[PDB]
Symmetry: C2
């Protein structure tokens, strides 16, 4: 039994991780503050999609295990587990049916296209929802502090060939 | 490798828990097998709603911590963390707008009304999605074995007055 403050996120805010799911898709997150993340998708169903300033519900569920959940303007729901102590990652993504049908529709810098994402969402089909539930391998972790706009500032296609070895 | 097998669910399958979220809503789950749960809602937004044989995605994310996620015929998405080692529980529920507007429409034994739930889901409005994200206090835990159909078999309103002391 571990005693810890489950409302203290100081062990998680600032974390910058790159990870590959067991379905082969490579993702990247940056925990920007107590209720915000930036993220960047490198490959897979929606490779090259990226997002800044996503509002999220971030909590501590173990001594060194954190959870982060959000809803996207596309209608997608996401809930991730980052177990830093054991270097284990697990993600659940609830995709609307229209995303599964034509995932390229979501591939953009979302911040410049929120009305588009909302329009696609509202047109549907929303259902049936597709649940993607996968462990991932964490391949990179560092601390970039809070509210750092330099961490995720371009699409993955614009990053150096050796990313993140350059870091 | 991890100090535990993340694909081994033997420590979670069969568990029966009752818990109360920090907003006072009381819930109950029974992990029936590796991909199925029954659950029963006692109070809150959708008090007295209950469900059997919900297909779920169940994983181990720490030595004594498990995660269970699913999508409902109503359109709702759920992702729960059960930290047995530290006796910590955290839930995220993504409700469709129509459920927030008329939650009583979902209050039933869902298994008797799946087409109805689908019809409400498809009529919507699906959006905006409302997120309930709360820790809970675990008040009861026991082991009931797998595929035990006696664990959850009535609405909470029909339970004995001293539940779960009778168990």
């Amino acid at each position: 039994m571990n005693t810890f403050d489950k409302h203290d996120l100081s062990g998680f805010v600032g974390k910058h991780l790159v990870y590959t799911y067991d379905n082969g898709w490579e993702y990247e997150i940056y925990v920007k503050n107590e209720n915000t993340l930036d993220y960047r998708i490198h490959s897979g169903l929606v490779g090259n999609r990226w997002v800044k300033d996503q509002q999220a519900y971030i909590v501590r569920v173990g001594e060194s295990i954190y959870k982060i959940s959000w809803t996207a303007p596309t209608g997608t729901d996401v809930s991730l587990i980052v177990n830093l102590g054991d270097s284990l990652f697990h993600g659940t993504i609830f995709f609307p049916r229209w995303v599964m049908n034509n995932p390229e529709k979501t591939v953009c810098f979302q911040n410049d296209h929120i009305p588009l994402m909302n329009s696609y969402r509202d047109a549907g089909p929303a259902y049936p929802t597709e649940v993607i539930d996968e462990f991932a391998t964490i391949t990179f972790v560092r601390d970039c502090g809070a509210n750092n706009e330099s961490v995720i500032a371009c699409a993955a296609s614009e990053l150096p060939k050796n990313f993140p070895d350059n870091l």
